[PDB]
Amino acid sequence: QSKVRSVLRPSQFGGQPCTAPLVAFQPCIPSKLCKIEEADCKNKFRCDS
Amino acid sequence: LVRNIPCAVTKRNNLRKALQEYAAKFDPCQCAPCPNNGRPTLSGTECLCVCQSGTYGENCEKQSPDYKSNAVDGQWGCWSSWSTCDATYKRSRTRECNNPAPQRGGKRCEGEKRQEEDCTFSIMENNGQPCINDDEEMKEVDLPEIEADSGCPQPVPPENGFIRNEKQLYLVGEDVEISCLTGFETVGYQYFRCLPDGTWRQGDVECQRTECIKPVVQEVLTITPFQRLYRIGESIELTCPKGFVVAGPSRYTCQGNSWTPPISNSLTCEK
Amino acid sequence: QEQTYVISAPKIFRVGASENIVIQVYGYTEAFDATISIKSYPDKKFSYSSGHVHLSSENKFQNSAILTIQPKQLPGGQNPVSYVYLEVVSKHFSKSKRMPITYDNGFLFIHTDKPVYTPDQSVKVRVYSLNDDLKPAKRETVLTFIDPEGSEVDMVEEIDHIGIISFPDFKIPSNPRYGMWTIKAKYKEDFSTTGTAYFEVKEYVLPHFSVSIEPEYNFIGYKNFKNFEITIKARYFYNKVVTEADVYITFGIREDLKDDQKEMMQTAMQNTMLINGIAQVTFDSETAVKELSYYSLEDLNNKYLYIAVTVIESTGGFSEEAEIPGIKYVLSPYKLNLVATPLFLKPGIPYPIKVQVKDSLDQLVGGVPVTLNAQTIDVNQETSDLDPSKSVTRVDDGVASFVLNLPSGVTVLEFNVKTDAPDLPEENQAREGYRAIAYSSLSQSYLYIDWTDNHKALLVGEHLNIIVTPKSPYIDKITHYNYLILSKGKIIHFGTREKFSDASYQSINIPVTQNMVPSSRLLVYYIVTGEQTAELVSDSVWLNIEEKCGNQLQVHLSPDADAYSPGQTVSLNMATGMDSWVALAAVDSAVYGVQRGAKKPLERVFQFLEKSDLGCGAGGGLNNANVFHLAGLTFLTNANADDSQENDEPCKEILYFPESWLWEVHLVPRRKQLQFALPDSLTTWEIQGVGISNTGICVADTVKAKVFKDVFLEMNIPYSVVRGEQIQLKGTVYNYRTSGMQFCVKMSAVEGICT
Amino acid sequence: YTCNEGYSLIGNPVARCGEDLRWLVGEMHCQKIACVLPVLMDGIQSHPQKPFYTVGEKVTVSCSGGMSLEGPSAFL
Amino acid sequence: VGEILSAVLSQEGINILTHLPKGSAEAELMSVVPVFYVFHYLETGNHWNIFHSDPLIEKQKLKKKLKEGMLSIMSYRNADYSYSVWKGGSASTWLTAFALRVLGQVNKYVEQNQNSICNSLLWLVENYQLDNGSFKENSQYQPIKLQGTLPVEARENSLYLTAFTVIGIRKAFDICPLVKIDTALIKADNFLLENTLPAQSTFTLAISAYALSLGDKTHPQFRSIVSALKREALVKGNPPIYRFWKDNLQHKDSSVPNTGTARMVETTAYALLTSLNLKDINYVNPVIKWLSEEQRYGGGFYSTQDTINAIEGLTEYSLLVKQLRLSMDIDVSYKHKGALHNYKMTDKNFLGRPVEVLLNDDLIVSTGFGSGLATVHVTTVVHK
């Protein structure tokens, strides 16, 4: 899960950079299941990619 | 570009949403203005000034000798937040050309100083995003299913009958109640029943005529329909507005199986 | 990669089962503890079960946790939980794996008192009801009656107090649909277990004597297409030869064992005499086909022969008929398939092969010659062809046996087995090509067992002794191998087996405990840490355990007689090794004669109980993972293997005159002797009972008892007579006295009949 | 839980140690496997009168003298 | 009952109670008429007993807002019981039919004074009942595009006007049954049928089919129109998981609701309502699942029309579902002789055993009001 914050003003003209992550992630245990499944194409050759 | 991928459309629309949030978060309009007509650009955490030709140094601060043109300025400010939904439920937002304001005949800020959008809300309790592809729905009439379960396919109902509960497949031992069209009555056992071999125990039943509809002939007036539906031998009056006749009787009746009616035209009499 | 673990579990968790989950860790020294737990999926929020297990050198770092998914703690509702998380947690690791769960917990053995019924009868029916453990289930149960049109007719439900569910007697509806009715039994509420049984409703009459038609073969080949030979015999249901019957033979063409009505014959329509219980008949199929039909040759005859026979007793009023619904004409009379054959090689160790020769009517051919061509590759496609061995089938099983002392380098065997009956050409000699593959270890590290592929089953309570040999580059690391013993889906025993200083490993000296008596399975494994990389090494084997019950309930008529008189007072003693319930039933053997093509109610009960085995084949596999999958196990390990590649495929490798009475249930407190009077029906009665105990079900030996008399009358009254019609009613009196004597029967009838 | 020998456990056999440190229980009940004597449909006298009889045990029954008792003299 | 779908409104029902400010453009009407439809959806009952997952809509607060909307809708009524959005604007037969629909819903809890309704019906029919097509719209300056919708005005918008007026009359008639209104209904239905025989554009076909579904559910050409609509239905999956209808290259992507999505959602909602009139749950289910996606998220143009028809369809589905829930104590008895049997027909005990009818008497079968549908057969067996 993602935790995110906003730039209130950018740095410029050599001021200190923001110097910290704008987004953090934390491992969850998910509540729902993945409804994404492979949509394997009907007829085109499926590359191993 | 996002095309021909699993959930292509859902990802596309998510990506549009994200792009709008991303622009709103990281648009360079929020920079302090560059000197000497530097166009600001923002790489997430820092504004960097693109210097005009004839301006140089790290961020354009020293001009060249020929630059002249001092304080000839002007560039867009940021968008306002959206207005609330107006009388026509349209929200709107504006940007003020004020960053920097136009000066000394420098350019007015480019493009539309306002945006307007019709309001919208998600109404239903969506449990989550569906994986929607580009074209998976496009089949209106698929291949006939294999029917591996070997039940009963839908029987053709008898004349003037219909299925209360039309389905592709009926279960073994399932019985289907036929019923008779608007003018008709069921006589006999109105249930077929699906046998284990896929036959239908086809009922000793047939729809008998109760009534006859108002006759389907092309008209505008020249008619007096006492009813939408008529018993056999009930009058239907085809009265001309001016006593002429176009075809057939100026009044008839459903004699039985039919009126034996004129098939070529209505009584659109001459007048 | 020294510190490694295996947790091994059933491939599927049965709902409410007690499942035994066993953990081994390697290369630890400090005594440490782990918990194994079952948790809701995907959220891991709810623990269905947990077990603390201490692991130490004292335990050789092995333990098991016993864990159960109580059926009420599952959320249930519209969606059954399909999957669940098995979890392990320790000071040193945590991992979780998504097990599937299944509600198919237990067995529902429907017993109806008879295989067939007439209209105006009632079907007394009861169900035996057991957990996945053989204990009585004590679960409330619903019968669903289904007619021959597939309509549901009744639901009746009962509370099980015993493991025996005596449902109310179902009266046949006042107008039945004819044919095969069906009963489906389900536990209420919370399990998918579904019993099923059938009965046919017909206007039958009890046959007076059995007619048996006895073709020499259910096929006709080159040898018999010229002429075939076919015995017929008949016996009265008191097991004495039918002295005299007029036999009329009615051949026909056939094309389909399932159903057809191809052209009946009108030539060689032999009428003949049955004497002393037997008639011998022959059929020059070539002559009859060429004379009657436009067919003239077996090449036109990848088809079947129909025969019906009717026989009239030459001095009496009872006449009976039977049929063979097809004898297969085919140029290839046999078919061939492998049995109990792993298709996985133990190189250098002898590779036995067993192959079964089977009829085109799915029946064992018996004695037939066979030769096995064999081709081997050891290494780098170095290819060598072995000399073709030859054998003959076992005369009863139709199973030929072979063994190949394959090279110690062999990596694959491709071998072609062909029937070697010289009288058939190769295009008609049943022949097959097969491939068998080595274990495909990564580190040339293997595990083999000395199991001699014993054709005889193991005898309960004997100490089995199987020698096991790991081989590896790293044998001096291995130190011990583990073993698991599987019965049904369940790990019933586990342990470990140390390397002697001899660099020889303890054999599996174990009693085959009574819970193994349904044919069971063994798997052995170790992890070796290699140079730095661990590999899980494992092997498995099938073990048949000879089907001896736990109760072994022995029931016998104490006044032993060749035959009792009708109405004879009898004393039936039931004895058991322990307190047991018993269900009893009596059915006339003539009722089994009523059904044209009969079967018994509880035939094959044990092979049905064995359906709970999740594994298949004789054992082995393409890999450790495949060995575990085919054993019906799964595992969690960090030792560089996982099951997930392999599909859950359905593996299918092959390894007063009553008609019934005594329909009763009783407690047998180890022994009880029950006396009763037999009916007046002079027939053999097939008496059967079923012991039910905590040890499990045991169908007793069936008791056949003859009711016989030196003189009697029987009358061939049909099932029903048309009102208001004069009829001819025929009977015969039977004399078994040494001598003739004057008899009369005075008939007496109600005024509703005139004669 | 499990009932004493000769009893069937009715309802949910399990309980759970809740976070309250107390047992949540399945409202369970124990019913004797031995059948009670059937209700005296008209006061019919069971000669082997006992409070309980096993399934398949026999009860031997007659009405008062001179009444033709309806149904069998036993239910099992 | 078979399959049941939990298609429901979100907590956004609370926003649709507090909905976008009442005021000019009849933003009040746009706010309140959803309040009414939400009212009736909640009136299906679940959303007060079970809604505790979300904030319960206060009964009294909903009632208050209802009352306020009733007064508002009255305020816009024309003096002659027509209606206009502009005080001085023209009578609109369309908007008046929309009023009649909404005021047909309201009576389920708060009847509108039927006199005013009857006068509005008389005005609308008497002024504008043409005899070949009907209710051609008066010179109202424009339809308020978010309040109304764009039919295919390029061809015979009289088809649209007739459909909408019919539907409004249907919703009113039960509170103002009038024989001449019945006759004008018959006329309009006839014209709408005969002029729907050419398929035109599928929105017209779906709205006409829904109008006829309110009328003769079983006329042969009605069914033929239905069989055409069911041909035009797109589906995903060989067993349809979703079913819906598109036109006019709406297959183009659109990240936001628009007039093309408005037309899509409207035509699909009319087909849904028609199928619910047919009570064809096995056909309706994949349509309800499709509609629950909110593909074109926000839906339609987010027009009043699409939203109202969508909620109407969802309410009618949940209604028909709970109607089919089987509960029926069918007691069968002889006419002269006593009772025979009393089947406690339930989702569990759904199938009582066959009973032989012993006694030689007429048989009367009966049930309590119960719920759902059942069928019962007697067979009689005899000799000749």
Ligand SMILES: *[C@@H]1O[C@H](CO)[C@@H](O[C@@H]2O[C@H](CO)[C@@H](O)[C@H](O)[C@H]2NC(C)=O)[C@H](O)[C@H]1NC(C)=O
């Ligand atoms: C067939 O035999 C039985 C057995 O004897 C007859 O039934 C008996 O009838 C007498 C009176 O005639 C009674 O006293 C007996 O108690 C009956 N026996 C029973 C009930 O077991 C029967 O009447 C005979 N039917 C005939 C000759 O048509």
